[PDB]
């Protein structure tokens, strides 16, 4: 919600709380990786992708964006 | 030029937040807070000869200047019961450059402030003393072959035979030169008179005597002819000397960028569409928006 509110540093720190708290749900890592990529970062986006793949669980839309971020990194 | 009584400005420069030469400060109060802007910014309110100035008292960059010829409704709201003291509030409602502004000034200190009474009193004096600083046509200036003087006014000279080079039949009149204005009134039909205050006079000269008034409040070209050219130039000298001595310190007769969007009286609206005639109501009503209708706006 914060990413779409022109407020991305709070999005960063919220994602930081989320990844420290979450264990068995890779969608948090995928969304954080997408945020980092769209922020042009792309270096720790691979760290988030790695945290996600360490947690694999397939929603019909959770796979396409995953593999699209994958081929991009 | 004089604008502190005519406009409502926001984020004023600290040089314009300072007393204009003819202006005098009347009262002040600290810890006044600005509502109708929900910033919670404490400030300080100042009532002067010609306007009310509020400034943040912490970041004086953000501030407001409201003229007395712009305020329509000045009301006092005594509320906020025992929970604390009676934090009196003030409600100013203004119409500047065809837009309605609303300012709310809340005195944070619980005591009742004496400033809110001096405000209304000086505003009353301002409104009742507009013969000092405005142009008037065909008004009531003469009791009986004799002028009616303002509070702070002395008549300096009275010239006769003064024609008016703006009409053709009611011309032979009298000219009163004073320390606050020059007036001319016809002999017959003494209701044909003009009164020009020095604040409005921009240039007096001969062309047979021509007053050119300030284009900021209507640029008129008033011409008067006198029989002896000697008296003509004498009167020109007197008028211009009085204009300059008045200009150094104006009397005023008062006896005693996108931030403005937040101060709308209406609300998210700053211009009125053109008034047309409504055949439904039989009255003049402002032009309706595209989709709306009168019976679709009246219903709830």
């Amino acid at each position: 919600a914060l990413t779409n509110l022109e407020d991305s540093e709070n999005a960063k720190r919220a994602y930081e709380e989320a990844v420290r708290l979450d264990k068995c749900n890779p969608l948090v890592n995928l969304n954080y990786a997408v945020l980092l990529y769209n922020q042009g970062e792309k270096r720790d986006a691979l760290a988030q992708y790695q945290e996600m793949e360490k947690k694999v669980s397939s929603s019909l839309e959770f796979d396409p964006e995953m593999v699209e971020v994958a081929q991009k990194l | 030029a004089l604008w502190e009584d005519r406009d409502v400005r926001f984020d004023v420069s600290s040089q314009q937040m300072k007393t204009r030469p003819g202006e005098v400060l009347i009262d002040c109060l600290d810890s006044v807070e600005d509502t109708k802007g929900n910033n919670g910014d404490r400030g300080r309110l100042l009532v002067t000869n010609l306007r009310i100035v509020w400034h943040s008292l912490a970041l004086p960059r953000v501030n407001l200047s409201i003229g007395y010829n712009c305020i329509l409704n000045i009301t006092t709201r005594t509320a906020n019961s025992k929970l604390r003291g009676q934090t009196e509030a003030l409600y100013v409602l203004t119409k500047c450059n065809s837009t309605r502004f609303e300012f709310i000034f809340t005195n944070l200190v619980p005591g009742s402030p004496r400033l809110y009474t001096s405000l209304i009193a000086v505003h009353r004096a301002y409104e009742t003393s507009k013969m000092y600083r405005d142009f008037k046509l065909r008004s009531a200036l003469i009791q009986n072959k004799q002028l009616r003087l303002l509070p702070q006014e002395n008549v300096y000279n009275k010239i006769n035979g003064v024609w008016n080079l703006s009409s053709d039949q009611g011309n032979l009149g009298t000219f009163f030169i004073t320390n606050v204005r020059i007036v001319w009134h016809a002999n017959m039909n003494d209701s044909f008179n003009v009164s020009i205050p020095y604040l409005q006079i921009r240039s007096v000269k001969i062309r047979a005597l021509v007053i050119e008034s300030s284009q900021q409040s209507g640029g008129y070209v008033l011409g008067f002819k006198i029989d002896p050219v000697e008296k003509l130039q004498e009167s020109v000298k007197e008028i211009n000397s009085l204009h300059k001595v008045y200009s150094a310190n104006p009397i005023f007769g008062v006896d005693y960028t996108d931030a403005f969007v937040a101060y709308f009286a209406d609300g998210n609206k700053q211009q009125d569409r053109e008034p047309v005639f409504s055949e439904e109501l039989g009255l003049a009503i402002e032009k309706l928006k595209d989709g709306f209708t009168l019976q679709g706006l009246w219903e709830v």
């Binding site: - | 009409s167 996108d258 409504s278 439904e280 109501l281």
Partner: protein, 436 residues
């Protein structure tokens, strides 16, 4: 801007003035023949001011004459024998004066002058209160006027000639007076809440044609005749609104839940109905077709007279006038402005000052969890005790009270010190004794 009287040419009209109904008039007093209207305003001081708004400015005021005595009523109509040109009649307590506002042009728009020339005057042997005018009988091209003295007497003047005067029967205070032409009748609202209609010929010959016991007394009464399909006598009571037939009974009535000040039935739009316009003492105008509220809008001031006229190429402009002096032309505001907080960028939150204060208050909050000496001396002798109390600051609202026991009794029980200035001493003395 929805439901507000959006402003037009407007001006405050004096220095602590006083106006009433019959002061505000709105017609073509200059006889320009075009069709625009000119705002005429008398005063309770004498300032007959005629304006022609051109949207303020200084070309608006046609003239601001000052007559000696107060101006009770102002009207515009054919008040002169020969000519069929509108004249201006002004009514003071003991004088009727019919003028003629003649304007002669100058080569420049601020060189044209206007003069009011006294066309005749009648002395009043009684103190008037108001007046009405019409074609008394069926005479054409004339507007002869009936003036109601404050002691209940209709003095009828056919223009330039005092016709007669009849004492209204059974009246103590004076009420609103109107004239109906479809019935050729004067209509009054007497003090005993009785709307009474008299026939003009019966008055000229002297009685009451008809009466109707409305429940109150009336502020204004307007017999509106723009429509000839069916004449109807409108009455604004001090609590109710009435429209009455020509025979006498109530065509309809509304029970206003407010205190009306002025009303004006202007032209109608539908078939048979009549749009009307009533102003509150809550400074609000109500537009009512029949009794149905068709609109309601907030006025700036509590109107004392409202009119609706065509001013400078705009029909149906509402012209209100108060008793302070606020004269205002206006139209109705029909913009349902959106309800949204303003999207300002300059105005932001001064987080530093506010956060210092918030940390201060939160400090007091988290801290809340973790100067007057009184001495009593008993004399060794109903023994007399003396209490000495001293401060070190400027204490206020001090109250001292003594409690001994049920059986024991004191001669003085309470002592009130409203304010005692700092480092000061107070000393009270009472005496206690056994009772029982």
């Amino acid at each position: 801007s929805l439901f507000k009287a959006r402003d037009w040419w407007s001006t405050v009209l004096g220095d602590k003035e006083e106006f009433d109904q019959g002061c505000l008039c709105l017609a073509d007093v200059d006889n320009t023949g075009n069709g625009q209207d000119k705002i005429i305003v008398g005063s309770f001081m004498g300032y007959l001011r005629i304006f022609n708004p051109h949207p303020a400015q200084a070309e608006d005021l046609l003239l601001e004459v000052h007559l000696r005595d107060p101006i009770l009523q102002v009207e515009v109509g054919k008040f002169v024998s020969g000519t069929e040109m509108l004249h201006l009649a002004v009514l003071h307590s003991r004088k009727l004066c019919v003028y003629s506002v003649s304007g002669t042009l100058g080569n420049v728009e601020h060189g044209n002058q206007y003069q009011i020339k006294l066309m005749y005057e009648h002395n009043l042997q009684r103190t008037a209160c108001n007046m009405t005018y019409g074609s008394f009988g069926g005479v054409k091209g004339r507007d002869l006027i009936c003036i109601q003295s404050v002691d209940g007497m209709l003095m009828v003047f056919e223009q330039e000639s005092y016709a007669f005067g009849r004492f209204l029967p059974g009246s103590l205070l004076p009420g609103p007076l109107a004239y109906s032409s479809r019935t050729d009748s004067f209509i009054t609202v007497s003090s005993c809440h009785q709307v009474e209609s008299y026939k003009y010929q019966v008055l000229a010959f002297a009685v009451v044609d008809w009466t109707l016991n409305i429940g109150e007394q009336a502020i204004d009464i307007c017999i509106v005749s723009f429509i000839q399909s069916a004449s109807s006598v409108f009455v604004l009571g001090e609590r109710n609104f009435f429209c009455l037939k020509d025979n006498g009974q109530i065509q309809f009535m509304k029970k206003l839940d407010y205190s009306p000040s002025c009303f004006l039935p202007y032209c109608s739009v539908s078939e048979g109905t009549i749009n009307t316009l009533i102003g509150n003492h809550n400074n609000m105008l109500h537009i009512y077709q029949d009794v149905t509220l068709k609109w309601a809008t907030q006025l700036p001031h509590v109107p004392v007279a409202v009119r609706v006229g065509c001013l400078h190429d705009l029909k149906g402009v509402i012209v209100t006038l108060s008793d302070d002096g606020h004269l205002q032309c206006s139209y109705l505001g029909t913009d349902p402005s959106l309800f949204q907080a303003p999207k300002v960028e300059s105005r932001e939150l001064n987080y530093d000052e506010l956060d210092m204060e918030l940390k201060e208050l939160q400090k007091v909050i988290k801290n809340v969890n973790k100067d007057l000496k009184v001495s009593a001396m008993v004399s060794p002798n109903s023994v007399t005790v003396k209490v000495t109390l001293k401060n070190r600051v400027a204490l206020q609202k001090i109250k001292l009270s003594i409690y001994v026991q049920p059986p024991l009794v004191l001669t003085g029980d309470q002592f009130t010190f409203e304010f005692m200035a700092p480092e000061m001493t107070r000393t009270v003395g009472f005496s206690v004794y056994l009772k029982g």
